[PDB]
Design a protein around this ligand. Sequence first.
Ligand SMILES: *Cc1[nH]c(Cc2[nH]c(Cc3[nH]c(Cc4[nH]cc(CCC(=O)O)c4CC(=O)O)c(CCC(=O)O)c3CC(=O)O)c(CCC(=O)O)c2CC(=O)O)c(CCC(=O)O)c1CC(=O)O
Length: 323
Amino acid sequence: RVIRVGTRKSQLARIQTDSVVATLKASYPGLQFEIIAMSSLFTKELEHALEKNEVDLVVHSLKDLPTVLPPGFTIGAICKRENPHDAVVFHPKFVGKTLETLPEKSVVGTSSLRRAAQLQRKFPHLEFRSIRGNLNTRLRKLDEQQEFSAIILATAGLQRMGWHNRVGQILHPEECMYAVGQGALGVEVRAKDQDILDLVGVLHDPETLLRCIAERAFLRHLEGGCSVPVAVHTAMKDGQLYLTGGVWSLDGSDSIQETMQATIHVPAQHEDGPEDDPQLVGITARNIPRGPQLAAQNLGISLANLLLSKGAKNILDVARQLN
Ligand SMILES: *Cc1[nH]c(Cc2[nH]c(Cc3[nH]c(Cc4[nH]cc(CCC(=O)O)c4CC(=O)O)c(CCC(=O)O)c3CC(=O)O)c(CCC(=O)O)c2CC(=O)O)c(CCC(=O)O)c1CC(=O)O
């Protein structure tokens, strides 16, 4: 069998897929890999090819995969996270500036409700208006017109394009927490395909795996739906897993944010895990110890429950109906 890899045509999707194939080819230099390019939600188009056996794995940005995947598919590999933080690209005239030092009423472009909500609260002296198009078009709207003084986007996308040099400012968590699963890639496969699941299991990075299980379990337990201001921050230091999560009204004046930790050790050994284990928030990692995997899910759930008892659902409901 030749391992067929499906991908979207867009530039960033192509670049992400190529980097995943490169990592698989380092582990499996003796196998052939073909990359098949194909044509508000694009995932189900790739998912249709995956179930009908026209491709065998699809590479996604993990934050584009909902917390509930269709029952026949699973995330079989959580690759090592790149830089997860949000970044600012400034207008050529504003080189050397920050969001704080931009003149008042400078327009900042972003179509992310999560970014607009957090940044309108942290920088009330700036307008945040929607910016439309792909990364290449957004950078041309920034350069050619004088509508936008800056645009907001994810660092990882700029880096994968090789455009690190256009990054003016990296936003820290206290300014802007990143989206659930941002900076990590997810390999999505048929749920009952033992062979592909075993092959891509080599891509699993234990720390990104556990960190993303907490972020996705936290996100799913709030049941806020699609396109709502939820942001997270994870870190593992000293055998502890830290999960900070927050919810905001669309405009940023309403916010609940809390942090909780748990003792969860990062596993270094691989194991031959059971074949009938259920997926955790759509993730199958049979070669990583499941104990820490469940504890990470338990951490996300506990923090979501804490936020909910402090009024998180009503913020999510106003934000949803105001979108
Ligand atoms: C109900 C529901 N649907 C989904 C899937 C889903 N996730 C998002 C978040 C998202 N995606 C993008 C575009 C993007 N994807 C990757 C990159 C590069 C960086 C990387 O690889 O991580 C980008 C561009 C970039 O971030 O710079 C955005 C940005 C939109 C913008 O800038 O204009 C976002 C929003 C954000 O980051 O805060 C979406 C939204 C797509 C959009 O254009 O708004 C969707 C589909 C949808 O909302 O309908 C999820 C998973 C969300 C998650 O895990 O983070 C859910 C939640 C659930 O299942 O309950």
